[PDB]
Amino acid sequence: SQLEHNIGLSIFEPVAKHRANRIVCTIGPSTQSVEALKNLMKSGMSVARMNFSHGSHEYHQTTINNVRAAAAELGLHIGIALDTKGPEIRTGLFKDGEVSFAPGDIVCVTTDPAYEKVGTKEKFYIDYPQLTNAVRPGGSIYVDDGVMTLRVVSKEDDRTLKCHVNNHHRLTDRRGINLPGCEVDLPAVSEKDRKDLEFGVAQGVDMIFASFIRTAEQVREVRAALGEKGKDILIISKIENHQGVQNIDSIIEASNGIMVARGDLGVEIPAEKVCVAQMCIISKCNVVGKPVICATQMLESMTSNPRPTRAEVSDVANAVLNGADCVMLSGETAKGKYPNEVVQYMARICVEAQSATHDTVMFNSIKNLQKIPMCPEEAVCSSAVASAFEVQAKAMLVLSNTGRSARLISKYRPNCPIICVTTRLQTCRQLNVTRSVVSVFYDAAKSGEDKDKEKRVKLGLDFAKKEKYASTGDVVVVVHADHSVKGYPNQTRLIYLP
Amino acid sequence: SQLEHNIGLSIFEPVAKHRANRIVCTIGPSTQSVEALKNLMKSGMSVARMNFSHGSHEYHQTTINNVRAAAAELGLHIGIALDTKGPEIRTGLFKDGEVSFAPGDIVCVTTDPAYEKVGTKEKFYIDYPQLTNAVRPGGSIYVDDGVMTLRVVSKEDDRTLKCHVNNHHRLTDRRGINLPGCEVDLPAVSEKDRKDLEFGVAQGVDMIFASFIRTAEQVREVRAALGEKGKDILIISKIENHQGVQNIDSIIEASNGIMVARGDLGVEIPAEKVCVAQMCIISKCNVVGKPVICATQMLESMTSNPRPTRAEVSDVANAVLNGADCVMLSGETAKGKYPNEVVQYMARICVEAQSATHDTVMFNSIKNLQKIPMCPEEAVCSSAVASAFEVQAKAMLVLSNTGRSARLISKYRPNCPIICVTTRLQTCRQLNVTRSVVSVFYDAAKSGEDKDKEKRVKLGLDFAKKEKYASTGDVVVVVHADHSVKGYPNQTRLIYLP
Amino acid sequence: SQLEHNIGLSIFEPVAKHRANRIVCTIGPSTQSVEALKNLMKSGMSVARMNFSHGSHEYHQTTINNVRAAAAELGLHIGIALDTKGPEIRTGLFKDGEVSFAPGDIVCVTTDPAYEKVGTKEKFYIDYPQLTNAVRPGGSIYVDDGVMTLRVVSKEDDRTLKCHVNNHHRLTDRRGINLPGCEVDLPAVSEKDRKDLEFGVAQGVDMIFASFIRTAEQVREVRAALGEKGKDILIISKIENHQGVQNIDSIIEASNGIMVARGDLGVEIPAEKVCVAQMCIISKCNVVGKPVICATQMLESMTSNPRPTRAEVSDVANAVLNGADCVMLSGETAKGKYPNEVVQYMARICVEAQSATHDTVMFNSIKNLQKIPMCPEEAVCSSAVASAFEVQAKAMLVLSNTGRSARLISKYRPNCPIICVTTRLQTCRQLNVTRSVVSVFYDAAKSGEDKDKEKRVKLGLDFAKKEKYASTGDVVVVVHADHSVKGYPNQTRLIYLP
Amino acid sequence: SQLEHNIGLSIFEPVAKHRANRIVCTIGPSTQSVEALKNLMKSGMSVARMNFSHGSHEYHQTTINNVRAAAAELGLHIGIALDTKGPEIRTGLFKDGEVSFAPGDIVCVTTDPAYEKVGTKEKFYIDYPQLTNAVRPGGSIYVDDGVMTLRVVSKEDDRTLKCHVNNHHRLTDRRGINLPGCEVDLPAVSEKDRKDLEFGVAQGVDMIFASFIRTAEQVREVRAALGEKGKDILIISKIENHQGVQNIDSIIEASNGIMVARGDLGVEIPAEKVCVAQMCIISKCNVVGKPVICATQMLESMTSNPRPTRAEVSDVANAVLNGADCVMLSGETAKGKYPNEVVQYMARICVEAQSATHDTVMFNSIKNLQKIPMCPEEAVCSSAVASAFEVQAKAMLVLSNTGRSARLISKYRPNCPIICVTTRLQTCRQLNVTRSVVSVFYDAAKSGEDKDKEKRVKLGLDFAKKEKYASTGDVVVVVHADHSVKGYPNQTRLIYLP
Numbered sequence A, B, C, D: 001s002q003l004e005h006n007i008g009l010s011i012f013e014p015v016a017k018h019r020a021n022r023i024v025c026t027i028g029p030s031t032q033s034v035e036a037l038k039n040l041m042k043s044g045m046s047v048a049r050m051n052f053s054h055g056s057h058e059y060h061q062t063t064i065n066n067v068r069a070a071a072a073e074l075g076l077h078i079g080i081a082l083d084t085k086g087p088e089i090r091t092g093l094f095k096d097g098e099v100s101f102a103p104g105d106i107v108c109v110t111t112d113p114a115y116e117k118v119g120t121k122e123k124f125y126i127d128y129p130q131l132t133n134a135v136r137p138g139g140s141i142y143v144d145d146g147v148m149t150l151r152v153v154s155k156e157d158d159r160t161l162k163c164h165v166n167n168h169h170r171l172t173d174r175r176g177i178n179l180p181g182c183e184v185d186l187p188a189v190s191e192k193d194r195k196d197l198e199f200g201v202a203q204g205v206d207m208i209f210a211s212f213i214r215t216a217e218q219v220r221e222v223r224a225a226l227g228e229k230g231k232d233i234l235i236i237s238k239i240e241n242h243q244g245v246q247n248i249d250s251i252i253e254a255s256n257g258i259m260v261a262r263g264d265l266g267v268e269i270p271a272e273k274v275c276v277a278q279m280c281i282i283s284k285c286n287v288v289g290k291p292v293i294c295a296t297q298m299l300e301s302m303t304s305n306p307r308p309t310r311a312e313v314s315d316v317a318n319a320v321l322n323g324a325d326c327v328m329l330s331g332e333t334a335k336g337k338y339p340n341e342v343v344q345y346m347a348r349i350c351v352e353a354q355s356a357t358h359d360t361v362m363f364n365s366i367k368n369l370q371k372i373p374m375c376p377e378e379a380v381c382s383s384a385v386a387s388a389f390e391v392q393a394k395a396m397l398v399l400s401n402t403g404r405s406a407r408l409i410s411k412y413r414p415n416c417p418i419i420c421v422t423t424r425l426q427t428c429r430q431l432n433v434t435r436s437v438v439s440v441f442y443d444a445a446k447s448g449e450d451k452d453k454e455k456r457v458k459l460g461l462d463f464a465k466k467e468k469y470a471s472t473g474d475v476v477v478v479v480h481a482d483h484s485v486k487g488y489p490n491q492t493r494l495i496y497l498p
C-alpha cells in the first residue's frame, strides 16, 4: 500500500543519481543571453519555452539562436517550444482609459461594437459576439484574470447583459475576460497565431504549446496550420478551461502531449478544482503513454526570493508523484532574480519525489489498464521494463528514430535511465519532454546505415559507460528489432556491459 | 489502483457536504477581536493557536477570553492550543530597525547582550549564549527562515564570531536563527516555557503544541511541567528538526499527536526533504490513530493577496490526501489582510481533496497494518466503520467521554461524519484535531447518569437530523457499550433514524 | 496467494477441534436400526437422507421413527431429508425380458406406445413422447446409466429414430434413459412424488432433496405441492443435467439450497465437465449464502473396503476447499459394510481440509461480491464475522428463529463455531446443512418470552462453555437485535465469557 | 479471486485444443506389447514407467525395447522411467496362496526365511530381518496397503513376533508391509537397487523414480550409484513417508523433481493428511520450477470398469489445479482391462482442468515469490511468458539443449504450448515431465552448427504450423540467445508466423 510505503521512507538515505523528470523553462530578459542559457542548461533546463504572448519575432529569433549556441557549446540537445498567445476575449476601451467599480454597481455589458471605445461605469464592450448565449442570468463573467467578477442579472436584448459588480476594481483598456463554465466558440488559431506558427515552422521549433485547446477539432486545426513542413513538430495541447477538461480523452488522442496549464485553468474553474483536474489529466496521459507537463506558479516566490515556500516544494514533489513527465517554470526564469537557483531547487525536488516513488506501482497500474491483446512492440516494451525490474538493471537502451519506442518504454515508468540512440537530432530534442530518456545521436550519413544495429548499440553502451549510468559487468536491457523486422522493435536482450 | 481512481475523477460532480478535515488558525492582530474570531469560526476555524513566541500573558489571556466569548455566542466548541516558544534563537535589535548585507560583508556576531539593542552591519547580537561552542569555523548560521546564511570565518573570542555574509539580504529585527547540524543544547522546557505551560494549565488550554521536540524524553518533560492538574491536556509534538524526524517513532508513542512543523523543519534539513518527512510522519500517525497537523506556508501568499497560488492550493489538497487530520494557518490569519477568506479557501480545498479520496483505500491500508488480535474496542470500531461503508451510512454516532473511542473510529477513516456524544466539554474541544468528528455535549450532572445510553443516543440522532447529516429512514451506525460493560464500547448497532 | 499459503502448510500441526462442515448419510439396511443410527450420529451424521427412489412409506416411516428415537436418546437435533424419485425416461419392455446389442447394430427407437411391451433388437420403445424433437441426427441417447450409448442416425417419422449401437450391452425391461444435452420437458412432480411429498409433510421432514430440477418453475411446483402445511420445509434442488447447470442462477434464487448431484450429472454431461459444474455451482451458492451439498461416490470404495482410495480422500477435501457446506454418503452408508468407519473418515478429511483453508480469503472474496448498499442485517453479520477474525474469537453466538441470521453469518465463513440459539426445533434440524452452525433450543413456552434476549444469550454462552468451544475470559461475538428492533438482528457485541 | 473466477465458469465453452499436462503410465502385461504401447502413446502416454518392484531385467529390457520401437514407428519421443523397488517390505508366500484372518486371530510373524514359502494363519514370513528391532510390543504392523493391521502382543524371540490380528482380511501373496513411526534402517540403494540403477544407465533410461527418499543425502546416494555415465539422468524423488515430507525442502533442492507417491504415503501417515502434503509439495515444486508428478489410485476403479468414479475424475482435475506437471497411472495401465480408455479419460480431464484454470494467477504467484535480482535468463523467460499473455500468443518457442530454459519457461505457467527445439534426444524425452512443453529434435551433427539460430527457429515455426498451434499471421514468442551469448538465453522476440 501507499501507506506502508510511506511509513518506511527515510530522509537520510542517498537519493537517485539520475534525475528522471524534466524541466521546461520560459526564457525572458533574466535568461535570454547565451551565458544565462548555458547556466540554465547546467542547472537542469531540458526545454526552452518561448511565450509568444509577448515579444516580436525578432525577440524570439534571438532566443532561438542563443539557445542553439549555448546548447552547441555544451554539447546538449535542448528542445525548443513555441507557446502560442492563442485566442482571447477582452473588454473594449474606457473613457479616460480607466474606470473604477464598487460592489453592488450595476453595469451593462454589450457585444455591440459601437461601444468598443467608449466604455464607462454604466456600460462597456466585450468582443465576443456570442456572449448572451454563452452566459445566462446567475452565471458569472470574470474580468482581468478573475480579479473582478460580475454576476449576470438579466439579458436586456440579444446583445446586452445587465450585470452586478461583486468587488472593488479598477479597469483599464482591453482587460482579459473569462466565461467560467461556458462553452466558448473561437478559432483554435488566430491570425497572429498563424504568423507565429509559420515562424516556428521556418525556424525549426521542436514543439508547439497550443494555448486554450477546447476540442480535438482545434488540435487538428493547429496541425493543419503547421502544414506539411511542420508535420513532425509535437503538438502539446494546453488545458486551460472546463471544455478542455471535459473533452480531455479526444484531446489526448489528437495531441502528442498535454500541458496542465493551471494559471488560466484556475481562473476558468474554481481554484480548488484544479487539483482534481491535474490528477485526472496526468493519469489519463500516463495511461496512453503521452507526455504531460505540469505548469504555472510551481516555485512562484523564487521569482523574488532565493528559496521557495513550503507549499511550493510540495507542489513540485506532488506533480512528480502524480505522474507528470515535466514540470515548468514561467516567471521564475523569464524575469525572476534567481533563475539558476530556481531550476536547481526544482531539479532537487524532482529527485526527492522520484526517490520516494514506489518502483513498480506505476508499472503495474499502467500495464493493468492496457487492452489485451497489445501490439507486439508494446508487449516488447512493457516486458523489457519488467525484465529491468527483475534484474535491477541500471539502464535500458532503445533504438528509436521517431522517438515512438522511447516514449513507449517511458510509458511503463522504469526506475532507471532510458538511453535512446536516435538517427534524428529533432528526436533528441523532442524526447526532452519524456520522463527518464537520455538521447544519443547516431550519424548514419557519417557512420553508415547500421542495418544490424551493432554500431548504434555500441554507441549506446559506450554512452552508458561514459555518462556513468552503468559500468563494466552491469546488465543493460536492450530493445530494438531483429535482423528482418522493420518499423518497430520486436526484440529485447539482456546484455552485460563489456 | 490510484491511477485507475484518478482517471475516473470529475470536476463536475457535486462535492461532499460535510467537511471531514479540520483547520487550525493562529491568532494575532488581524484576528484577536471577538467579532473577528466569530468570523473565523464561521469561516471554519476549529482550533485557535496562540503562539507564545510573541506576546505577554495578558495578550494571550485576551485571546483565551475572546475565543470563549465568540464560541459561546455561536454555540461552538473551539479548541485552544498553546504553542510554545521553546528553544528558539533570535537576533537582537538593529540601528534604525534594519541593516542591509552584501555577499562578502565580513560581520561580527556576539552573544554579549550589551549589543542587544544596537546591532549594525558589522556587529550584532544573537540570544544564544553558547553560540561559540555550538558552531565552529567553517560552520554556517542561518538567519530569518534560512534566507540569509553566514559562514563562520573565525572565533574572535568566547562571546564573538567573525562571519562571512554569503548572500544579499536586508535584515529586520529579532529575526529567527537556525543552526542545523550544530550541537544546540537548550531545554525543551526553558524557564520561560515552564511559566507559559503553567499559565496554560491555569487558564485551561485544551492542548500544547510543543516546539522543537527531539526525543520522547522531551515529551515527558513537557508532560511533567504540565503537572497533576494538566494531565488531560493533549501534547502535540512539533517535528521541526533532524532529530525529531530520526526519533519520530518514540516521539509519536509518547505524544497525543504530532505537528509537521514545516517552517523550522525546512531550514533544519534541506527544504526538498520536507515532502518525504511529511509523507512519512503523517502516515505513521494514521497507522497508530493519532491526530496529525500539517503546518506552515500552506496559503502563504494570501497574507497579502485575495487569492492563493496554484502551488498553495495543491499544498492544502495534498496534505489532506496524505492523510493529515488538520491543516494549519499562521501569518495568514495572525497578521494577514484576508483572514476570513484564507480560511474559506482552505475549507473548500479540504472538501475537494476529501471528495477526490478513494472511499476505502485508507480503511484497508490502516487495518491491514494492525497487530491481530485487536482489543475488543478496536475490533468494534473498525468493523463499525466497515458496516458504515456496507450500508452507505450518512453518519456514525459514538459515545465517548475521554475521546478515545471517537479517535479510534476516526483512525479507520470513514467517509461520513462521526457524531460524538461526550460528557466532557474538554473532550468536545480536543476532538477538533480529529478528522470527521463532530461533538455534542451531554451534561450528565444536569441530565442524569444515562446508564442505558438512551439519552445520549437520542441527543446524537436529533443532532444528526438538525445539522442535516441524515433524515428519517437513513441508517446510522451507533457505537457504545451494552448495558453491562464499562470502560470501552463493545457494541455496534445499525439504526434507522426515527 | 493460494500458492504461498500452500508452501507454508504443515501435516504435523494440530488440526481444528471443531468440525465446520456437515455430513449427510443415506439410510438403508446397513444403518436403519436405532442402534446403527446412534452410531452414525456419534460418527458424525448431521442429516439422515431417505432415498424415495426405493422402498415403501412403511420402510421410510421406520427410518423416521428410528432417527428420532436415536437422536432423542443422544440429545441431538438430526435433520431428516426426503430425496425424491423424480421424473424419469425409461425404455419399454423386451421380448423374453432381455436383448443383447453389438457395436454397429442398427436399432429403431420409437415413442409409439404400441411397441411398449414388445422390444426387440430391431426396435424398442422409449416413453418420452417428445423424443424426436429433443434429439437430432448425430446426437446421443444413453441407456442404462450411460453404459450403452446410441448415435441418432436419422428421424424416420415423427415417432421413430434410426440409431447406431456404440458398444456391447444387454438390455432388460425398463432401463433408464438419458438424453445428454437435450432439453427434457417433464413435470417437476410425478404422481408418485406427490404421494411422497404428502407423506413427508405429514411426518414432518425438514427438507426435500428434489430430484432432476431443470428450471426455477419446477422448484415452484415443488413448493406448491408442499402446500401451506409444508411452507417451512427447505427445498434443496438437485442439479443433475445440463439444464440445471444452465439455469443455475434462477434455480438458486428459487431454492433454499442446492445439491450437486454428481451421479446423474456425470451421465448427462461429459464426466470431466462435472468438476467445472461443481466449482461453479458451489461458488454461486457461497456468493448468495445458501447451503450447498456435494454428493455421490465420494468414498465409494468404502462400500466394501475399510479404508478409502487416494482419489476419494482428495475428493472430499476438495469439496470442502471448493466451499461446500455439506458432503454426502449414498451407498457407503445405505448398504455398505463400514457405515461408521466411512462417516468417521469423512469427518477427519473435512477437518483436515478445514484446517488447511486460509482463514479470511473466503470472507473477503464473498464480501467483495455483494451489492452495496447491503441490508442492515447483512452488514451486521458480515462485520460480526470480521470482528471475530480481528479478536480471534473462539465462537460466535446468534439468535435466530427461522435460521436466516445463522445462515447469513455462515455465509461469511468464520473460522470458529457459530452457536445458534433458536426457538424452533425444526430450525435446529434445518441448520444441520449449514457450515459451522451448532444449535441450542430455547423453550419460550417453558422459560418465557425473553424480549430482552438475556436468557437466550445466557443459554448460548453456557452452551459454549459446556461444549468446550470457549471458556471463561474468551471473547465471543454476539449477534441479535437491540431492545426495539424486530424481525432481524441490528446489533453485534463482543462479550467476555464470565 | 478464485471465487469470482469460479462463478464465471461454463460447461458450454470450447475447451483448450492443446493439452498442457503430462501423463505417466506404468507398463505391465496389459501394456507391454509394441502394439499396446503404440495405442497408449496415441491415447496420450508421455512417459513409460517400469516398476522394478517386480520383474527381471529381461522383462524390463523388453519394455525398453518395445517402447523405443513403438515410439519410432509413431515418430514420438517418449520418456522412460525406472522406478526402484527401494526399501520395500513384503510378506512371503502362503499355504494355497491365500490365508484368511479374523479379528483376534493371534498370529506369529517371523523373519526366518525357512517359512518364506509356507505361510499359514498362525505363522508367516516377512522379508525384513530387523523386524523385531524395528517394532516392539504395542506397536502396529500394516499389511497390504494398510488394509489389515496387527498389534504386536509380544517378542517371542529375535526372529519372531506374536501378533493380534485387528480386523477381517483375506491375505494374498508377497503383500506389502508398512511400519509407520517405526525405526526402519534400510538403504535407499540396496544391493538389488544398485544393479537396477546400473542396468538403467547401461540401457539409457531418461529418469529414476527413487522410492522412499527420506533425505537429501539419500538423493545423493542415488546420484552416486548412477555414476559418471548416469549424471544427466533425472532423479525424481518419491515422497512416501513421514520423513520425506519433513525434509521436503532439501529433498527438493537435491532432486531434479518429485513424485507425490500417495500409495505408500497414505499408509505411512494418516490417509486424510495426504491432501495437505500433496498441496504443499506440489506448490513447493512449482515455486522452484521443478517437475512434480501426482501418483497412485487416480483412476483406480478403471482397472476393472469402463468409466471412472466421480471422486476419481475430481482427483485428476484437482492435481492439475493444484499445479502438478504430471499425473500418473499404475495398475490402471499395468494390469487393467481398459488401459487405452483410462489414459483417454485422464487426458480429457487434464484439458478440462487446464481450461478451468485462471490464466495468470499462477504466473503472478510464482513470480512474486522469486528472489530479486533474478539471473538474466530467468528475467528473460518470465518476461517472455508475460509478453505471451499480453499478445495472446498461441505458442512460445525456446531453444534448449539441456532442457533448463524449457523448464524455466514452464515454471511461469503460460497458457499456450512451449515448443522446444533441442539438440539432444534425451532432452526431448526428459521434457515429457514438464507442463506445456512439446519437443522438436535438431540434429546439429547432421544439419550444422546453427550459430545464428535460424535453422532451429525455422524448424520450430514450421512445427508450430504443422501441429496446428498457430498459422500465418499469428505472433509467436521466441526465446534464445543473441549472436554472442553462450550458455543461456538472453533474448526474446515476437515474430509473426510467415
Ligand SMILES: O=P(O)(O)OC[C@H]1O[C@@](CO)(OP(=O)(O)O)[C@@H](O)[C@@H]1O
Binding pocket: A398, A399, A400, A401, A402, A403, A404, A405, A406, A451, A453, A479, A480, A481, A482, A485, A486, A487, A488, A489
Ligand atoms: O523510430 P521508432 O518508431 O521508435 O522505431 C524504431 C525501431 O524500428 C527499427 C527497425 O525498423 O528501427 P531501425 O530500422 O533503425 O533499426 C528497430 O530497430 C527500432 O527499435
Ligand SMILES: O=P(O)(O)OC[C@H]1O[C@@](CO)(OP(=O)(O)O)[C@@H](O)[C@@H]1O
Binding pocket: C398, C399, C400, C401, C402, C403, C404, C405, C406, C451, C453, C479, C480, C481, C482, C485, C486, C487, C488, C489
Ligand atoms: O429468525 P431470524 O430471521 O434469524 O431473526 C432473528 C433476529 O430477530 C430478532 C428480533 O426480532 O429476534 P427476537 O425477536 O427473537 O429477539 C433478533 O433478536 C434475532 O437475532
Ligand SMILES: [Cl-]
Binding pocket: A118
Ligand atoms: Cl456614450
Ligand SMILES: [Cl-]
Binding pocket: C118
Ligand atoms: Cl413385433
Ligand SMILES: [K+]
Binding pocket: A051, A052, A053, A083, A084, A085, A086, A211
Ligand atoms: K502563451
Ligand SMILES: [K+]
Binding pocket: B051, B052, B053, B083, B084, B085, B086, B211
Ligand atoms: K512557537
Ligand SMILES: [K+]
Binding pocket: C051, C052, C053, C083, C084, C085, C086, C211
Ligand atoms: K432419489
Ligand SMILES: [K+]
Binding pocket: D051, D052, D053, D083, D084, D085, D086, D211
Ligand atoms: K517401485
Ligand SMILES: [Mg+2]
Binding pocket: A240, A261, A263, A264
Ligand atoms: Mg494561460
Ligand SMILES: [Mg+2]
Binding pocket: B211, B240, B261, B263, B264, B265
Ligand atoms: Mg517552528
Ligand SMILES: [Mg+2]
Binding pocket: C240, C261, C263, C264
Ligand atoms: Mg440421481
Ligand SMILES: [Mg+2]
Binding pocket: D211, D240, D261, D263, D264, D265
Ligand atoms: Mg510406494
